Scaffold this motif. Structure first.
Motif, PDB file in Angstrom:
ATOM      1  N   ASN A   1       0.819  -1.067  -0.278  1.00  0.00           N
ATOM      2  CA  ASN A   1      -0.192  -0.113   0.030  1.00  0.00           C
ATOM      3  C   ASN A   1       0.746   1.350   0.057  1.00  0.00           C
ATOM      4  OD1 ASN A   1      -2.641  -1.478   0.229  1.00  0.00           O
ATOM      5  ND2 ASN A   1      -1.794  -2.240   2.036  1.00  0.00           N
TER       6      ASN A   1
ATOM      7  N   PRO B   1     -24.334  -5.787   8.748  1.00  0.00           N
ATOM      8  CA  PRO B   1     -24.251  -5.243   7.492  1.00  0.00           C
ATOM      9  C   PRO B   1     -23.881  -5.951   6.273  1.00  0.00           C
ATOM     10  CG  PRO B   1     -22.340  -4.510   9.105  1.00  0.00           C
ATOM     11  CD  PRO B   1     -23.181  -5.495   9.651  1.00  0.00           C
TER      12      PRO B   1
ATOM     13  N   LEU C   1     -25.681  -0.854   6.080  1.00  0.00           N
ATOM     14  CA  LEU C   1     -24.768   0.187   5.865  1.00  0.00           C
ATOM     15  C   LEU C   1     -23.690   0.192   6.985  1.00  0.00           C
ATOM     16  CD1 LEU C   1     -26.911   2.420   3.654  1.00  0.00           C
ATOM     17  CD2 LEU C   1     -24.887   1.402   2.694  1.00  0.00           C
ATOM     18  N   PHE C   2     -22.520  -0.052   6.564  1.00  0.00           N
ATOM     19  CA  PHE C   2     -21.366   0.267   7.375  1.00  0.00           C
ATOM     20  C   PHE C   2     -20.494   1.632   6.713  1.00  0.00           C
ATOM     21  CE2 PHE C   2     -16.939  -0.826   8.918  1.00  0.00           C
ATOM     22  CZ  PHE C   2     -17.197  -0.520  10.399  1.00  0.00           C
ATOM     23  N   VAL C   3     -20.324   2.434   7.297  1.00  0.00           N
ATOM     24  CA  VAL C   3     -20.210   3.856   6.369  1.00  0.00           C
ATOM     25  C   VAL C   3     -18.956   4.608   6.897  1.00  0.00           C
ATOM     26  CG1 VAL C   3     -21.186   6.198   6.113  1.00  0.00           C
ATOM     27  CG2 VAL C   3     -22.610   4.305   6.279  1.00  0.00           C
TER      28      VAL C   3
ATOM     29  N   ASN D   1      -6.964   5.298   8.351  1.00  0.00           N
ATOM     30  CA  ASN D   1      -8.347   5.385   9.034  1.00  0.00           C
ATOM     31  C   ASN D   1      -9.279   4.777   7.725  1.00  0.00           C
ATOM     32  OD1 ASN D   1     -11.003   6.470   9.063  1.00  0.00           O
ATOM     33  ND2 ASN D   1     -10.404   8.198  10.097  1.00  0.00           N
ATOM     34  N   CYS D   2      -9.308   4.998   6.464  1.00  0.00           N
ATOM     35  CA  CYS D   2     -10.171   4.230   5.471  1.00  0.00           C
ATOM     36  C   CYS D   2      -9.584   3.000   5.307  1.00  0.00           C
ATOM     37  CB  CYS D   2      -9.806   5.091   4.285  1.00  0.00           C
ATOM     38  SG  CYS D   2     -11.142   4.532   2.774  1.00  0.00           S
ATOM     39  N   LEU D   3      -8.280   2.698   5.383  1.00  0.00           N
ATOM     40  CA  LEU D   3      -7.629   1.410   4.803  1.00  0.00           C
ATOM     41  C   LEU D   3      -8.442   0.075   5.953  1.00  0.00           C
ATOM     42  CD1 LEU D   3      -6.253   1.000   2.319  1.00  0.00           C
ATOM     43  CD2 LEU D   3      -4.485   0.238   3.615  1.00  0.00           C
ATOM     44  N   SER D   4      -8.180   0.816   7.119  1.00  0.00           N
ATOM     45  CA  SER D   4      -8.475  -0.141   8.338  1.00  0.00           C
ATOM     46  C   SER D   4     -10.156  -0.349   8.391  1.00  0.00           C
ATOM     47  CB  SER D   4      -7.988   0.154   9.701  1.00  0.00           C
ATOM     48  OG  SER D   4      -8.473   1.414  10.091  1.00  0.00           O
ATOM     49  N   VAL D   5     -11.142   0.672   7.959  1.00  0.00           N
ATOM     50  CA  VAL D   5     -12.490   0.347   7.898  1.00  0.00           C
ATOM     51  C   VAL D   5     -12.561  -0.580   6.788  1.00  0.00           C
ATOM     52  CG1 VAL D   5     -14.477   1.282   6.809  1.00  0.00           C
ATOM     53  CG2 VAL D   5     -13.103   2.798   8.163  1.00  0.00           C
TER      54      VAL D   5
ATOM     55  N   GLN E   1     -10.227  -3.094   5.475  1.00  0.00           N
ATOM     56  CA  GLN E   1      -9.951  -4.295   5.904  1.00  0.00           C
ATOM     57  C   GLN E   1     -10.916  -4.947   7.013  1.00  0.00           C
ATOM     58  OE1 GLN E   1      -8.211  -5.052   9.404  1.00  0.00           O
ATOM     59  NE2 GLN E   1      -8.186  -7.334   8.757  1.00  0.00           N
ATOM     60  N   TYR E   2     -11.532  -4.366   7.897  1.00  0.00           N
ATOM     61  CA  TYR E   2     -12.135  -4.681   8.911  1.00  0.00           C
ATOM     62  C   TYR E   2     -13.745  -5.265   8.241  1.00  0.00           C
ATOM     63  CZ  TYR E   2     -15.569  -4.517  12.877  1.00  0.00           C
ATOM     64  OH  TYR E   2     -16.365  -4.876  13.883  1.00  0.00           O
TER      65      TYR E   2
ATOM     66  N   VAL F   1     -13.229  -8.984   8.218  1.00  0.00           N
ATOM     67  CA  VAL F   1     -14.004  -9.475   9.401  1.00  0.00           C
ATOM     68  C   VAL F   1     -15.491  -9.355   9.351  1.00  0.00           C
ATOM     69  CG1 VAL F   1     -14.285  -8.932  12.057  1.00  0.00           C
ATOM     70  CG2 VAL F   1     -11.976  -8.457  10.867  1.00  0.00           C
TER      71      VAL F   1
ATOM     72  N   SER G   1      -3.912  -3.808  -0.932  1.00  0.00           N
ATOM     73  CA  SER G   1      -3.630  -5.197  -0.532  1.00  0.00           C
ATOM     74  C   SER G   1      -4.564  -6.039  -0.014  1.00  0.00           C
ATOM     75  CB  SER G   1      -2.340  -5.244   0.632  1.00  0.00           C
ATOM     76  OG  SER G   1      -2.870  -4.405   1.803  1.00  0.00           O
ATOM     77  N   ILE G   2      -5.797  -5.356   0.507  1.00  0.00           N
ATOM     78  CA  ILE G   2      -6.688  -5.781   1.492  1.00  0.00           C
ATOM     79  C   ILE G   2      -7.689  -6.566   0.426  1.00  0.00           C
ATOM     80  CG2 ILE G   2      -9.102  -5.368   2.645  1.00  0.00           C
ATOM     81  CD1 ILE G   2      -7.228  -2.856   3.510  1.00  0.00           C
TER      82      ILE G   2
ATOM     83  N   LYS H   1      -7.061  -6.871  -3.283  1.00  0.00           N
ATOM     84  CA  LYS H   1      -6.300  -7.679  -4.099  1.00  0.00           C
ATOM     85  C   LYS H   1      -6.216  -9.165  -3.685  1.00  0.00           C
ATOM     86  CE  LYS H   1      -2.255  -6.676  -6.440  1.00  0.00           C
ATOM     87  NZ  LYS H   1      -1.530  -7.057  -7.499  1.00  0.00           N
TER      88      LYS H   1
ATOM     89  N   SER I   1     -18.683   4.424  12.185  1.00  0.00           N
ATOM     90  CA  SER I   1     -18.770   3.575  11.043  1.00  0.00           C
ATOM     91  C   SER I   1     -19.929   2.476  11.313  1.00  0.00           C
ATOM     92  CB  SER I   1     -17.673   2.847  10.391  1.00  0.00           C
ATOM     93  OG  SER I   1     -16.749   3.933  10.156  1.00  0.00           O
TER      94      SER I   1
ATOM     95  N   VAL J   1     -14.194   3.899  12.633  1.00  0.00           N
ATOM     96  CA  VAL J   1     -14.575   2.828  13.591  1.00  0.00           C
ATOM     97  C   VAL J   1     -14.206   3.361  15.010  1.00  0.00           C
ATOM     98  CG1 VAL J   1     -13.811   0.429  14.222  1.00  0.00           C
ATOM     99  CG2 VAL J   1     -14.040   1.014  11.748  1.00  0.00           C
TER     100      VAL J   1
ATOM    101  N   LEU K   1      -5.443  -5.786  10.260  1.00  0.00           N
ATOM    102  CA  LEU K   1      -4.900  -4.501  10.313  1.00  0.00           C
ATOM    103  C   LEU K   1      -5.711  -3.492  11.289  1.00  0.00           C
ATOM    104  CD1 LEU K   1      -3.170  -2.378   8.846  1.00  0.00           C
ATOM    105  CD2 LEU K   1      -4.980  -1.980   7.123  1.00  0.00           C
ATOM    106  N   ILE K   2      -6.773  -3.504  11.457  1.00  0.00           N
ATOM    107  CA  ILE K   2      -7.898  -3.049  12.149  1.00  0.00           C
ATOM    108  C   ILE K   2      -7.458  -3.086  13.966  1.00  0.00           C
ATOM    109  CG2 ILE K   2      -9.339  -5.004  12.545  1.00  0.00           C
ATOM    110  CD1 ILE K   2     -10.544  -1.260  12.189  1.00  0.00           C
TER     111      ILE K   2
ATOM    112  N   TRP L   1      -5.419   0.048  14.571  1.00  0.00           N
ATOM    113  CA  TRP L   1      -6.450   1.239  14.965  1.00  0.00           C
ATOM    114  C   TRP L   1      -7.084   1.044  16.265  1.00  0.00           C
ATOM    115  CZ3 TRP L   1      -7.540   5.588  12.350  1.00  0.00           C
ATOM    116  CH2 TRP L   1      -8.827   6.347  12.587  1.00  0.00           C
TER     117      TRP L   1
END
Ligand SMILES: [Zn+2]
Ligand SMILES: [Zn+2]
Ligand SMILES: [Zn+2]
Ligand SMILES: [Zn+2]
Lengths: 186, 182, 182, 186
Positions: free
Chosen positions: A84, C1, C26-28, C42-46, C48-49, C53, C128-129, C131, D9, D32, D81-82, D85
């Motif tokens: 990334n 969601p 919706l997860f937002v 911030n966005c990337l971990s959202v 990935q989660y 998950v 990476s998430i 892909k 979120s 999150v 990854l989370i 965070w």
């Protein structure tokens, strides 16, 4: 400290060697492939601190040949989180894909290394921090170098900016000079 | 390379001279006050690349005395963007506020530089990157160091971790050793 | 969601009304000009989660016309810290500088809002998430949308991806369709 | 827009409902567990834009009960990854570990949710952005709420700050009030 040095985490030669400066004169940031990502809090806060607080008047971005980060950006394997980080390098690759395509395969890495530095100086000069320092007449020069690991010598490149206008000219000229190919093609 | 070295941007000693190792052995990250901030993409990706791709087995975090970053964090002037970075150090000061309070003002900085290193090693050890490497039996040791140039010396800052168990123990112990005052 | 929705902080329509779905589906995530910046923790971990998950199978990126973030990126005033965030949009403008130049100044914004969505979906698809989820046969579709309130309508902004193949094709095609001018 | 809203979120109720404001009045950031991490470029740039450019005078941080992010922070599984965070949430847990330990296990999540909001307002009020706005006499209020998903009602909490001094008092008082336990212990 009178110099902020942004180098690569690979690079094994300390900034002391590459600048000939005494220890104490260099403030140093090191990350993978010597990037100034627009929204990297780490590097940006370093730059803001160097420029606004320490009143450093020179920032040197130094890349180097045979750079693992550059190579890793190009190999494009599933390396995990680092992929990334390196996506900013692949964007630069594709921004210059026609040029890079004219080179022999084994010459492309070291061309990407040089292009990278130019692009990172261009990013640095566009930060709110550097643009504001320039706007208010602060003396501040940006320098983009590449160190040749093979022959232990620098290559000043000629990316040098002292204002927003010379940033444009210097960046454009650097890319134009990189586009003139020697014996790197068949 | 065999070592990842995380040090400070205002440090005036090269990692190669501290470690007395080959130019070649050290993969190097430097940021202000040598932090491993949980959500810093820059440092974290260095760590992930070092651990997962380069298969490095030693991570050193190296602080130093007379650190301009620690001093800035303590002065709490309106320095701008950098203050946000250094709030993580202020959180560390507050966490150890009782300890740091019962100490002479001119000695707080150097205590905080040492506490900081223990806290960053603890952070490093709690990354998904390092936790998961330890979980899958991978060989990996974390070292917290502080160097001082009143003269020229080091201290593996009581913080050495090879597992999450040894991370808790070494962290708590490092804090307890720092809490005994000269 | 079942959906991750990535939208803009200055958008004035809730995701629930756009999607016409349950409060629950919706997860937002919302940020300025609905970006997926490669190295934004911030966005990337959202993401990935959501992907790894919550096992969400649809990601929507939703832009909008009359976007204050896109307008700010274009005005290029000295706005401060936010300008650094919006430089990613300026990079997008320059990448499509020829296309955007051969268009009336009062129409550039809305073209750029649409190009932006295609670029962010392309970024999302290159994480990476995502892909790696596609590589292991996981069911996952990306949608780029723009909504417009001159009246009230949407457009699955020609960008739909279920794989890296369909990401290249859909990205290039979305750009080519946007390049035909009214 | 007159309000910046920082929500989770997870949260399924739009800020329109929880504020009763008309669409157009809210500028919204969602991440999150509704965090203001000191060095998060995303959230910080949103706040700087809201405060310095849009001249927004109210920032609302809103958490909620039965928060998956909070639960996930507490379960401490290898989520990937989370996890990194959420480590900021576990720091807050351990900063208040003696308090949280006095609660019955099934009460601890919703206490962490409330503590989280207080801690995030405290972070927001300490940003260079908010501190500077206050220093120069700009009118700016910070609000920390928690929404009860079970009974669809707010809980204002009482974290409210209009200056650096009321930030200290409000934050301290909030934690003191959270420390007075009802029937949450055995
Ligand atoms: Zn390198
Ligand atoms: Zn230092
Ligand atoms: Zn917008
Ligand atoms: Zn939540």
């Amino acid at each position: 400290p009178h110099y902020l040095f942004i180098g690569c985490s690979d690079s094994r030669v300390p900034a002391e060697k590459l600048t000939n400066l005494e220890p104490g004169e260099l403030f140093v940031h090191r990350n993978v492939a010597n990037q100034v990502i627009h929204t990297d809090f780490n590097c940006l806060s370093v730059v803001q601190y160097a420029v606004d607080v320490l009143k450093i008047e020179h920032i040197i971005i130094c890349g180097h040949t045979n750079c693992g980060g550059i190579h890793a950006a190009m190999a494009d394997k599933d390396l995990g989180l680092i992929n990334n980080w390196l996506l900013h390098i692949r964007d630069i690759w594709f921004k210059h894909g026609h040029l890079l395509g004219k080179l022999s395969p084994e010459k492309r890495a070291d061309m990407l290394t040089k292009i990278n530095v130019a692009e990172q100086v261009y990013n640095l000069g566009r930060t709110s921090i550097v643009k504001s320092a320039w706007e208010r007449g602060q003396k501040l020069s940006l320098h983009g170098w590449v160190y040749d690991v093979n022959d232990g010598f620098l290559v000043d490149q000629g990316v040098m900016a002292t204002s927003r206008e010379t940033l444009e000219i210097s960046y454009r000229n650097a890319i134009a000079r990189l586009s003139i190919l020697d014996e790197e093609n068949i």
